[PDB]
Amino acid sequence: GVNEVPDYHEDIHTYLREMEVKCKPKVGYMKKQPDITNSMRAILVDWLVEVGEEYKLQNETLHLAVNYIDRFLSSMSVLRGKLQLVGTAAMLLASKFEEIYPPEVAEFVYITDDTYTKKQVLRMEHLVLKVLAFDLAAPTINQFLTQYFLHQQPANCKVESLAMFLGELSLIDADPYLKYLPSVIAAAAFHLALYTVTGQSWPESLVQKTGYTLETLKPCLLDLHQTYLRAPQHAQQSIREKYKNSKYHGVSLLNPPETLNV
Amino acid sequence: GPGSMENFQKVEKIGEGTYGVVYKARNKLTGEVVALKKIRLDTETEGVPSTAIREISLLKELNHPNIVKLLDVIHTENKLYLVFEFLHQDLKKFMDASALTGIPLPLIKSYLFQLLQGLAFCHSHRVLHRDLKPQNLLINTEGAIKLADFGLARAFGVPVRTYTHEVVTLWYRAPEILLGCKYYSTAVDIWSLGCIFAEMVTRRALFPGDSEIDQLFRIFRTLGTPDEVVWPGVTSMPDYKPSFPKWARQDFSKVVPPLDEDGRSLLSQMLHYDPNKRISAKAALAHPFFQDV
Ligand SMILES: COCCn1cc(Br)cn1
Numbered sequence: 001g002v003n004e005v006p007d008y009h010e011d012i013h014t015y016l017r018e019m020e021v022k023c024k025p026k027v028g029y030m031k032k033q034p035d036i037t038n039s040m041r042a043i044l045v046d047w048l049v050e051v052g053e054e055y056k057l058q059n060e061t062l063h064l065a066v067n068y069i070d071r072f073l074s075s076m077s078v079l080r081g082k083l084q085l086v087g088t089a090a091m092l093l094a095s096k097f098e099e100i101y102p103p104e105v106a107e108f109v110y111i112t113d114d115t116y117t118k119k120q121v122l123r124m125e126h127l128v129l130k131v132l133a134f135d136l137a138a139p140t141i142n143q144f145l146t147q148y149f150l151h152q153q154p155a156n157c158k159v160e161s162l163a164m165f166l167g168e169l170s171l172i173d174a175d176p177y178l179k180y181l182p183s184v185i186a187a188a189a190f191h192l193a194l195y196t197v198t199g200q201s202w203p204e205s206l207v208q209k210t211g212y213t214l215e216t217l218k219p220c221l222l223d224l225h226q227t228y229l230r231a232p233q234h235a236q237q238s239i240r241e242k243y244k245n246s247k248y249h250g251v252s253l254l255n256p257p258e259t260l261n262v
Numbered sequence: 263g264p265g266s267m268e269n270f271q272k273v274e275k276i277g278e279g280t281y282g283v284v285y286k287a288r289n290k291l292t293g294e295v296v297a298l299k300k301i302r303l304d305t306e307t308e309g310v311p312s313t314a315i316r317e318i319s320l321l322k323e324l325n326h327p328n329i330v331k332l333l334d335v336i337h338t339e340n341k342l343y344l345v346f347e348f349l350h351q352d353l354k355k356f357m358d359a360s361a362l363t364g365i366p367l368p369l370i371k372s373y374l375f376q377l378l379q380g381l382a383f384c385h386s387h388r389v390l391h392r393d394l395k396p397q398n399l400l401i402n403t404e405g406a407i408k409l410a411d412f413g414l415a416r417a418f419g420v421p422v423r424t425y426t427h428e429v430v431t432l433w434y435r436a437p438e439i440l441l442g443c444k445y446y447s448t449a450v451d452i453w454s455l456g457c458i459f460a461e462m463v464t465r466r467a468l469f470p471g472d473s474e475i476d477q478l479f480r481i482f483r484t485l486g487t488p489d490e491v492v493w494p495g496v497t498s499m500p501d502y503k504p505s506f507p508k509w510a511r512q513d514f515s516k517v518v519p520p521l522d523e524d525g526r527s528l529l530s531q532m533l534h535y536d537p538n539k540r541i542s543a544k545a546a547l548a549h550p551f552f553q554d555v
Pocket residue numbers: 039040041043044047080081083084
């Protein structure tokens with residue numbers, strides 16, 4: 001009902017689809033970063049995953065922070081020594097936007113292991129706000145996922161949590177995931193989750209809503225499927241650990257399908 | 263954006279608040295009258311406040327004739343200036359000072375119709391206002407009325423998650439919040455507008471409570487105490503108590519006597535207990551009450 005805003009969900013979907021195009025990072029941004037790499041970014045995002053679970057932050061907060069980070073690094077060159085400072089300020093901004101009870105600035109200083117000062121954290125907050133032009137209401141994979149979830153016949157918590165997990169895995173790996181829009185990754189993640197748990201495929205009703213088909217999702221899905229298979233071997237493991245928790249139905253323990261037939 | 267305080271001449275203070283002080287000001291190059299809301303960051307050990315981050319980020323996206331426009335944001339290490347479109351008055355002051363024998367029906371309809379446009383625009387852009395009250399509705403000399411003060415607003419997801427509780431100034435606060443409901447949605451903004459519609463007619467607040475529990479009881483005594491028939495789930499709600507007095511719903515023509523049949527219809531749909539049946543802004547724009555607006 002009203003919690004699902006029947007009268008506004010299309011308007012909102014359409015608007016997010018527009019905004020995800022505006023809020024998109026530069027796909028090729030890391031090659032133009034002289035001192036940082038996909039591998040360092042992966043370490044940062046993985047860390048922010050740990051910070052969110054330590055402070056019991058929403059998953060939306062996590063997605064927003066990554067969006068802020070990727071956009072910032074799209075126009076600003078950063079030394080490896082300061083990548084964490086950017087990440088910290090992003091998490092703060094994301095928390096202040098999205099959390100009922102954001103962690104205090106001092107806690108943000110604390111988790112950086114006294115690498116940075118309270119003063120440094122706050123001045124970067126200011127810089128990120130300058131660079132993003134306060135454009136913080138970004139569409140995330142989660143905002144799309146939760147709408148897609150309304151198309152399950154019937155609702156399945158293993159499906160939902162698994163989709164969330166896969167979406168989160170994509171945040172870690174700029175190559176290849178920077179090239180896909182949140183809505184497309186969410187589509188891939190939803191279908192893969194659904195297939196894995198129930199054998200069923202991307203619903204026609206979601207073809208109506210999104211205009212996406214298995215045809216158009218195929219590239220992303222082949223990448224997401226590989227990310228899923230290799231996930232136990234990835235250098236970064238914080239998302240897998242997180243999704244062992246019962247809160248998320250221990251979905252990281254489910255077995256990926258060996259093939260998609262797609 | 264492209265602004266500097268050297269181009270503004272302050273004129274008078276026009277209001278204050280936790281946010282800070284607001285000045286009426288004039289652009290010396292273009293002639294534009296603006297409102298400047300100053301946010302002190304030098305006084306801030308917690309950096310840029312979350313209210314300001316929401317207000318700015320959410321208003322950047324909302325361009326609509328019935329939402330006050332954010333023209334600019336001036337950045338300083340010490341200060342933060344929000345430059346707003348200027349509007350001479352707010353609805354509360356218009357009600358207290360000039361509306362002594364009433365607001366005429368044409369003008370009530372016009373304002374309510376414009377408020378619904380503004381609110382429908384918010385909801386279509388996944389924004390809850392969460393503080394709609396007459397003080398936060400600005401009127402100009404041309405007859406426009408505009409949603410202002412998005413400091414308590416929030417960007418929602420679909421479906422909504424649990425957000426902050428006890429939002430909304432008490433008199434304007436929806437029963438689902440007062441009953442501690444885990445989830446609230448666009449229906450809370452409609453409730454507020456409903457309260458405001460009544461208030462424009464009578465010039466007095468509809469439910470002026472002194473406590474959450476007094477607020478509820480005032481509502482219950484006006485619309486009757488809700489049960490599982492009028493509002494499925496009500497008796498399962500976290501702060502619903504079975505001991506609640508059971509008041510009979512009084513005839514709606516007694517709630518706002520001067521209101522006509524169309525008026526009463528629309529108001530009743532705005533003040534429906536069940537958030538699921540409560541009318542949307544989008545739907546309310548088509549209500550017969552507006553036929554002659
Ligand atoms: C000097 O540190 C290398 C860059 N880096 C920091 C984090 Br957290 C992730 N990568």
